[PDB]
Amino acid sequence: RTEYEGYLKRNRLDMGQWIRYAQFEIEQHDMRRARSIFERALLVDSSFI
RNA sequence: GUUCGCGAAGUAACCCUUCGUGGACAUUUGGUCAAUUUGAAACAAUACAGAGAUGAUCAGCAGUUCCCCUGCAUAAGGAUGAACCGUUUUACAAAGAGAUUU
Ligand SMILES: [K+]
Ligand SMILES: [K+]
Ligand SMILES: [K+]
C-alpha cells in the first residue's frame, strides 16, 4: 500500500496504476479498500471507460 | 473606616467624650495555563558509505509530491535540496480454414 500510494501521489494520472492498486486490494479480499481505490480513480478521471 | 441623623452616660449647661442605633459612601479579582520521569523540540555521538544527465569530471534551471529546511522575503540558498528510476493484460472484436462433438 505504501508503494502504490507513493506512485499515485507522485503521478495521480497513471490510470493503469490506479487499476492495478484496486486489483491488489481485490486480491486481499478487502472490497471496501478496492471500492475506495476505484472511487478515487473516478475522481481523477471519470471519462476513462 | 468616614460622615449625616437619632437614644444614652459624663458636665451646672454648651463644646467635647464614650456606649448603642438608623441612613449614606465603597460592591465579585484570576485561570485556554498545577511544581522533574508517563502527551511528546532537536542536534550530536559510533559505524559504514562518499553527489544526476558519464567512458570521465562537472555548471545548471525546472516540473510533480498528503517531504520540507535556512531566510524579512513573491529574492536567494539548501547535492540540479530531497523523493522521481519500481510494477505493468480485458471498451477485445471481425473474417476464414483444418481438425474435435450429437
Ligand atoms: K565524491
Ligand atoms: K549540480
Ligand atoms: K539550486
Curated annotation (Swiss-Prot):
Q: Where is the signal peptide?
A: none
Localization (cell): Nucleus
Positions annotated as HAT repeat = 1-27, 29-49
Organism domain of life? Eukaryota
- Role of this protein: Involved in pre-mRNA splicing and cell cycle progression. Required for the spliceosome assembly by promoting the functional integration of the U4/U6.U5 tri-snRNP particle into the U1-, U2-dependent pre-spliceosome. Also recruits PRP19 to the spliceosome, as a component of the NTC complex (or PRP19-associated complex). The association of the NTC complex to the spliceosome mediates conformational rearrangement or stabilizes the structure of the spliceosome after U4 snRNA dissociation, which leads to spliceosome maturation.
Q: Which family does it belong to?
A: Belongs to the crooked-neck family.
**SUBUNIT field:** Belongs to the NTC complex (or PRP19-associated complex), composed of at least CEF1, CLF1, ISY1, NTC20, SNT309, SYF1, SYF2, and PRP19.
Q: What else is known?
A: Present with 2140 molecules/cell in log phase SD medium.
Its protein name is Pre-mRNA-splicing factor CLF1
Q: Which organism is it from?
A: Saccharomyces cerevisiae (strain ATCC 204508 / S288c)
Q: Which residues of the full protein are shown?
A: 51 to 99 of 687
